[PDB]
């Protein structure tokens, strides 16, 4: 009855203007995930350079307040655990490490130390592909998904697994999963475009629905309102589509491609890599960024008001399913100098937000850049 979607939702009528606050490059290569501590006091970004870096949300008026590197391999997913006390990270090394964060006052330097660890045999589980943490009081389970389809709920209260699910690999590689804010159900998105719903109460596979284009589920999120809807980001055409798992109908879609809406023909190579969704004032906001490196603010209540956040007006402006279609407009005097391109210049891999006294967007790309916006 009372599961809040966000510990701190966006301010009322929040509209990210696209002002860059911090340009960060402390990572040697591609950043894989951006996660914000549920306190919004810190956030963390992991990278293919094998390091993870933790950042102070309040210092985004900049420096990696903490850093860790002693796992090796590409660290490609992390999550906080409903507080800045714990932060878990995982690498293609198959190591799952529970880092404890030490919060200190200004005079004494902070530190990170590993306080829990697991290793996955590459022949029997493979590395993780995604993970999520969700408290239930009696347990502090860290669910994570592995290449062999195992989805394991590691209870951070001990070494015991709360539960384990065996995704049918005939549906392809697990590319992302999400869990209900109510913790009643779960949905697995795959490289072949299949969403497979699991009822976490019974731990049974209740349903399987497949994208008609049979294309990779790049991100998966529960819907902030409709308890049976899953926001599945799909490869090609920047397609973000809400799927009602109670019936399998694709019943809302965001589209931004040269290909006409929902067409299976030659899809654009661009794809959405990060989706942030919030109910706000009951007017749900969905913010997407990806391989076209253009952050799009989508207003699901008034889609005509949707706009590109990652760029000024120097850039070219823009089946019974409610599809929002983006069509580029069919559009010298040196009226002041040309400014530097503020946006990313490489594939954006994730989007996150924090609300420390203002609504900031964090974005990161495959070159290791991390950018803060407001």
């Amino acid at each position: 009855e009372n599961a809040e979607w966000e510990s701190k939702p966006p301010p009322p009528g929040w509209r990210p203007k696209g002002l860059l606050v911090a340009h960060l490059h402390e990572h040697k290569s591609a950043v894989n995930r951006i996660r914000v501590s549920d306190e919004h006091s810190l956030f963390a970004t992991c990278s293919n350079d094998g390091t993870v870096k933790i950042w102070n949300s309040q210092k985004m008026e900049t420096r990696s307040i903490l850093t860790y590197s002693r796992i090796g391999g590409r660290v490609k997913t992390l999550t906080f655990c409903q507080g800045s006390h714990y932060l878990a990270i995982a690498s293609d090394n198959g190591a799952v490490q529970l880092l404890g964060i030490e919060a200190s006052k200004l005079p004494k330097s902070p530190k990170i130390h590993p306080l829990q660890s697991r290793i996955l045999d590459q022949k029997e589980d493979g590395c993780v592909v995604d993970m999520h943490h969700f408290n239930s009081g009696a347990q502090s389970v860290l669910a994570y998904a592995t290449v062999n389809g195992s989805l394991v709920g590691w209870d951070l209260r001990s070494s015991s697994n709360a539960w384990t699910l065996k995704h049918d690999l005939k549906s392809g590689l697990i590319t992302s999963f999400a869990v209900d804010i109510h913790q009643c159900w779960l949905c697995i998105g795959t490289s072949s475009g299949t969403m497979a719903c699991w009822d976490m109460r019974f731990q049974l596979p209740i349903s399987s629905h497949c994208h008609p284009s049979r294309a990779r589920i790049r991100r998966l999120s529960m819907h902030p309102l409709y308890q049976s809807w899953v926001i599945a980001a799909v490869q090609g055409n920047n397609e973000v589509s809400m799927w009602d798992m109670e019936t399998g109908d694709r019943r809302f879609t965001l589209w931004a491609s040269s290909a006409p809406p929902l067409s299976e023909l030659q899809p654009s190579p661009h794809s959405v890599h990060g989706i942030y969704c919030s109910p706000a004032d009951g007017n749900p906001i969905l913010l997407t960024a990806g391989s076209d490196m253009k952050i799009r603010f989508w207003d699901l209540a008034y889609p005509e008001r949707s706009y590109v956040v990652a760029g000024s007006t120097s850039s070219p402006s823009v089946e019974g399913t409610e599809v929002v279609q983006e069509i580029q407009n069919k559009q010298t005097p040196r009226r002041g100098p040309e400014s530097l391109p503020v946006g990313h210049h490489d594939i954006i891999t994730d989007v996150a937000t924090f609300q420390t006294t203002q609504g900031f967007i964090v974005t990161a790309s495959r070159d290791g850049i991390v950018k803060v916006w407001k």
């Binding site: 490059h25 402390e26 990572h27 040697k28 900049t62 420096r63 990696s64 290791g368």
Partner: protein, 61 residues
């Protein structure tokens, strides 16, 4: 505030080029640019992961 901006700005540009961390100081406005514009900084023009390290942030803050 303009001096704070300009000096912090220069230092940020200095760090972006991986200039010698021990030489740069937050007050020596023109000397900082001199180390950046002269051939002494072999890395000038390179684009890569600068870090604005703690030993240089603590001097500013």
């Amino acid at each position: 505030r303009a001096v704070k901006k300009l000096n912090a700005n220069i230092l940020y540009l200095c760090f972006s080029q991986h200039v010698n961390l021990d030489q740069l100081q937050p007050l020596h406005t023109l000397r900082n640019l001199m180390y950046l514009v002269s051939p002494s900084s072999e890395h000038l023009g390179r684009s890569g992961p600068f870090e604005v390290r703690a030993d240089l942030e603590e001097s500013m803050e």
